[PDB]
Short mmCIF file of C-alpha atoms in Angstrom, two decimals:
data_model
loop_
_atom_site.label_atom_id
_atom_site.label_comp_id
_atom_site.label_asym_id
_atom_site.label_seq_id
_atom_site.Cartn_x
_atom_site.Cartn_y
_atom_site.Cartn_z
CA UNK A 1 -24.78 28.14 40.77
CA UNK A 2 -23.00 29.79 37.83
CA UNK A 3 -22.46 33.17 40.46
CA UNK A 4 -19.38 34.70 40.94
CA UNK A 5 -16.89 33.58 44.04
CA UNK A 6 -14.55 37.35 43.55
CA UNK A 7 -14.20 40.01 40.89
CA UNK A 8 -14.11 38.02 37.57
CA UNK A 9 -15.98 36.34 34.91
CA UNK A 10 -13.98 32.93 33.67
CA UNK A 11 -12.90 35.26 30.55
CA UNK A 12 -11.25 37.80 32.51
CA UNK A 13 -10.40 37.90 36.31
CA UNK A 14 -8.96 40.53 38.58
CA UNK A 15 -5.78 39.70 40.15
CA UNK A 16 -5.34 43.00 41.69
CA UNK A 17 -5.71 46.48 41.93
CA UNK A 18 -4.82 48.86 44.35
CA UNK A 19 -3.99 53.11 44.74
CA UNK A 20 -1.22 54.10 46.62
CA UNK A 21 1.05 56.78 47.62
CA UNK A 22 5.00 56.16 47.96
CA UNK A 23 6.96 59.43 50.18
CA UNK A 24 9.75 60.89 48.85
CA UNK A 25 11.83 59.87 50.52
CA UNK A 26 10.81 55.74 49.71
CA UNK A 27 14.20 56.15 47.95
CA UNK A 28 16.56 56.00 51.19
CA UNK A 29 13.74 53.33 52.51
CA UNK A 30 10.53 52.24 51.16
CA UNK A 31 7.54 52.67 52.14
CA UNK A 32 3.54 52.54 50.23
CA UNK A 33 0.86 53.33 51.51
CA UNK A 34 -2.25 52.29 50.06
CA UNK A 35 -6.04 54.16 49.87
CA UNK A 36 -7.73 51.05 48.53
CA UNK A 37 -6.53 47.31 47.67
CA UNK A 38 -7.83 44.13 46.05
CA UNK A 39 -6.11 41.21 46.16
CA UNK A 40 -7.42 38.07 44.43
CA UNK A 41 -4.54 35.87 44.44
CA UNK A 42 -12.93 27.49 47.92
CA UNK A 43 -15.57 29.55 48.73
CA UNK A 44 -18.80 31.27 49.03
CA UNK A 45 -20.80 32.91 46.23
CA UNK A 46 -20.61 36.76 46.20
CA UNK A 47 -23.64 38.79 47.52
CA UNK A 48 -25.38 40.60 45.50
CA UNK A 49 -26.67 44.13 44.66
CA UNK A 50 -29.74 45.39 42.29
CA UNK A 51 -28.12 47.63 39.77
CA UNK A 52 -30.90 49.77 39.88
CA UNK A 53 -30.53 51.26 42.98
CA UNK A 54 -26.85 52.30 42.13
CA UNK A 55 -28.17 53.57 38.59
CA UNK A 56 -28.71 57.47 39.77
CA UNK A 57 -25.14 57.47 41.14
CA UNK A 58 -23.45 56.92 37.50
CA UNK A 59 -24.35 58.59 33.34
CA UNK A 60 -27.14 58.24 31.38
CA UNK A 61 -27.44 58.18 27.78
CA UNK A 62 -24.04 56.49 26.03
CA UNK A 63 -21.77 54.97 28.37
CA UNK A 64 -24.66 55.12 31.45
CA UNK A 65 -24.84 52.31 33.43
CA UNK A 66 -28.63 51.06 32.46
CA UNK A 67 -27.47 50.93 28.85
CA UNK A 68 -24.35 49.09 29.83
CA UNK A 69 -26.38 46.37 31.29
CA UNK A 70 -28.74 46.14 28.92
CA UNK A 71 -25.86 45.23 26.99
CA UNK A 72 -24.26 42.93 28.66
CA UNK A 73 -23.29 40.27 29.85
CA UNK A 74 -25.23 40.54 33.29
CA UNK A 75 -22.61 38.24 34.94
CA UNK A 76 -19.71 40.72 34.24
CA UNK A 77 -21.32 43.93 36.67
CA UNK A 78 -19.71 44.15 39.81
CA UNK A 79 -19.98 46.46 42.57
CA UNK A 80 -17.16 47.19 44.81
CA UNK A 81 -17.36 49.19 48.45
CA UNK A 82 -14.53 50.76 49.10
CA UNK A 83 -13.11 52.25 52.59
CA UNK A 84 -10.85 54.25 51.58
CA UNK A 85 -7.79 54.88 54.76
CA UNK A 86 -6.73 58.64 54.08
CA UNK A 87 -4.34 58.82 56.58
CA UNK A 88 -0.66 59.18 55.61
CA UNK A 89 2.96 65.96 50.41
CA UNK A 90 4.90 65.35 47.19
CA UNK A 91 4.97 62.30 46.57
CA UNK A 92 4.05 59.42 43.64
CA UNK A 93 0.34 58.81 43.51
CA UNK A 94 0.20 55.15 41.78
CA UNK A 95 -2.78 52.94 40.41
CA UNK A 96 -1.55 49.15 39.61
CA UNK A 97 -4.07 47.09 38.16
CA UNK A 98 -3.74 43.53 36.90
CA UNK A 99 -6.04 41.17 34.84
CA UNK A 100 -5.93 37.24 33.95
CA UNK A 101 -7.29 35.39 31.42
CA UNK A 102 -7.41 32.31 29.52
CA UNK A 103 -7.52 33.70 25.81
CA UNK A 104 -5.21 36.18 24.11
CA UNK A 105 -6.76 39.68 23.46
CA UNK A 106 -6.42 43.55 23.59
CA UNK A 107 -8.07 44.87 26.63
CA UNK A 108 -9.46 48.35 26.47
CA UNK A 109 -10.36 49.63 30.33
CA UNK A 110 -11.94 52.84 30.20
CA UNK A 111 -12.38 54.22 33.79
CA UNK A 112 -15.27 56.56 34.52
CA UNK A 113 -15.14 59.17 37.29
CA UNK A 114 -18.08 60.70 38.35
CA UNK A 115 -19.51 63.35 40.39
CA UNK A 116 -23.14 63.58 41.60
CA UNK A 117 -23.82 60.96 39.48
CA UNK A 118 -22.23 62.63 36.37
CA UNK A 119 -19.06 61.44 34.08
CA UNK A 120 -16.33 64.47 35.44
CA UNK A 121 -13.18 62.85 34.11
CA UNK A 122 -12.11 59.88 32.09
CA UNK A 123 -9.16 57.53 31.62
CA UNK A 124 -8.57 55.19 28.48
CA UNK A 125 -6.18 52.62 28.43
CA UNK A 126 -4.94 49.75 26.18
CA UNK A 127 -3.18 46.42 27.20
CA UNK A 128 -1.40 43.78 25.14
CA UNK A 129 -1.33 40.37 26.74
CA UNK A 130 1.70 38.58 27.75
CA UNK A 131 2.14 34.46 28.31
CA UNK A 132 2.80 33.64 31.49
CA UNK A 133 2.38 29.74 32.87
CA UNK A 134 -0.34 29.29 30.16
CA UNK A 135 -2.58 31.83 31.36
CA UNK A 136 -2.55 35.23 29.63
CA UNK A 137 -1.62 38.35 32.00
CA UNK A 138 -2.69 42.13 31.67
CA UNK A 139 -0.12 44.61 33.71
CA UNK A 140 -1.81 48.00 34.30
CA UNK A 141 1.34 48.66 36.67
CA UNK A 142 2.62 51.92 38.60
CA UNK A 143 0.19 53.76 36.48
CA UNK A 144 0.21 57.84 37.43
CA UNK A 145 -2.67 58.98 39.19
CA UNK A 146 -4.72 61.84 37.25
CA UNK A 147 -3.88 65.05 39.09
CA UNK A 148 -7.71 65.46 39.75
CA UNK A 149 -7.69 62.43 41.71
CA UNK A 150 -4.31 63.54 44.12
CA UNK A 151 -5.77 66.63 44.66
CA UNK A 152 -8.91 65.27 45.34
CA UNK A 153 -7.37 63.34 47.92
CA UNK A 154 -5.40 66.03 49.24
CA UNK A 155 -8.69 68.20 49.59
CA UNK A 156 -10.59 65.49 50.92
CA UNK A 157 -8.03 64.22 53.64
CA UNK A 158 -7.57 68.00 55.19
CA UNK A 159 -11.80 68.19 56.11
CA UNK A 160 -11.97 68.48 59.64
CA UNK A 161 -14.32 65.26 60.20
CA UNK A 162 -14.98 62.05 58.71
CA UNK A 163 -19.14 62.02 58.67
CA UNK A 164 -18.06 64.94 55.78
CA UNK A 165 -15.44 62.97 53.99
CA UNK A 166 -18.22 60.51 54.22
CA UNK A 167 -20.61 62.87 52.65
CA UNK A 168 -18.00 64.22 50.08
CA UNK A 169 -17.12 60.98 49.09
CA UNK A 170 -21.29 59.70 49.04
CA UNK A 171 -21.14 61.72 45.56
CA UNK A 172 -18.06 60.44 44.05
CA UNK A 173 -18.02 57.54 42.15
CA UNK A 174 -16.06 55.32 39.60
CA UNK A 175 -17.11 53.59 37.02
CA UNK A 176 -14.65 50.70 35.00
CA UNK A 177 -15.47 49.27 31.48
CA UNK A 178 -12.87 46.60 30.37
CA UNK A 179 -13.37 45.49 26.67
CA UNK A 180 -11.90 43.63 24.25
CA UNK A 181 -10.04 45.89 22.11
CA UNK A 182 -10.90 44.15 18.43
CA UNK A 183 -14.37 42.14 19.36
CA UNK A 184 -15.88 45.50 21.54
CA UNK A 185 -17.16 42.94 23.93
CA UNK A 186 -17.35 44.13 27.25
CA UNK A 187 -15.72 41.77 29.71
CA UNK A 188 -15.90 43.45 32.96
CA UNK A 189 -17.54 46.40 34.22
CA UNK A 190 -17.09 47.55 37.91
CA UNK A 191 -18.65 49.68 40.02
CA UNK A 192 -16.51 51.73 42.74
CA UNK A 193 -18.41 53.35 45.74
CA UNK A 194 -16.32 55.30 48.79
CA UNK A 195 -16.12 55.37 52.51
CA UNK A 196 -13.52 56.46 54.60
CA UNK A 197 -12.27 54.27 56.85
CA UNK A 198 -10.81 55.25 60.56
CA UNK A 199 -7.41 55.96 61.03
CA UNK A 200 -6.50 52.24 63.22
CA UNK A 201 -8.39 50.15 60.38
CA UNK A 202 -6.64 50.30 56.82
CA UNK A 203 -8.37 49.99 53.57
CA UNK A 204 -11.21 47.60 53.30
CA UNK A 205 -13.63 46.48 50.38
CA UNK A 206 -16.57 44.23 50.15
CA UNK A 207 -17.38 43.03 46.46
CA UNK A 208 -20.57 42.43 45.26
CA UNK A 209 -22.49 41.08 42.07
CA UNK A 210 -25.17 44.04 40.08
CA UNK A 211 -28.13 41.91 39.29
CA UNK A 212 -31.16 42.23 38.02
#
């Protein structure tokens, strides 16, 4: 119909996002290696996933995910599966994230992290656009990982089988609010739930639209 093809209203797409880990020693040759990865750079309409089920897993009250929706616009709730490949200490933990759009604006992208369903830590950031080819580009590039999440990661890679990474990670979740800095409009809001994947397959996702 009007349903979403990838992660992305026609206000604001995701190009890509991805977390990463470079050695130390990516200096004398480089090297990334990469927990999870979206790329979005003719097809199908996404599937799609009632937001209420997923509604436990994230806040209540201001900022919960029922009173996001209720705000709006339904079309811009995504959810997105990650496996997560934890296989790879010391060095850079990186989160790149990139965003297109037709219009000029001030993106806000507050991302939510959340454990047992409950907001642990937070990360607010602001983005100028910049004119490129007539569309307008967001770069969210090479940003530092929050040393919660690289110790989370170091914890959670060392547990002696996956089924408990599995149910670590079943309570751990991430929740991603991008607004328009001056309107408050909320343009995209993404939901992040984990796997780990095995060590011979790499990071995977499957995407999904929150309806209702």
């Amino acid at each position: 119909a009007w349903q979403a093809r990838g992660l992305g209203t026609a206000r604001l797409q995701l190009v890509e996002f991805s977390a990463f880990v470079e050695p130390p020693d990516a200096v004398d040759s480089y090297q990334r290696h990469l927990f999870v990865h979206i790329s979005q750079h003719g097809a199908p309409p996404l599937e799609s996933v009632d937001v209420r089920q997923i509604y436990d897993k994230f806040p209540e009250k201001k900022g919960g995910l029922r009173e996001l929706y209720d705000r709006g616009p339904p079309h811009a709730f995504f959810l997105v599966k990650f496996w997560a490949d934890l296989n790879w200490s010391g060095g850079f933990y990186g989160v790149s994230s990139q965003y297109e759009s037709l219009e000029h604006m001030t993106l806000t992208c507050s991302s939510k992290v959340c454990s047992f369903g409950k907001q642990v830590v937070e990360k607010v950031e602001t983005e100028r656009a910049q004119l490129e080819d007539g569309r307008f580009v967001y770069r969210l590039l090479r940003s530092p990982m929050c040393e919660y999440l690289v110790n989370f990661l170091h914890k959670l890679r060392q547990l002696p089988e996956r089924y408990m990474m599995n149910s670590v990670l079943e309570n751990f979740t991430i929740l991603q609010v991008v607004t328009n800095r001056d309107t408050q409009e909320l343009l995209l809001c993404t939901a992040y739930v984990f796997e780990v994947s095995t060590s011979e397959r790499g990071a995977q996702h499957h995407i999904y639209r929150l309806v209702r």
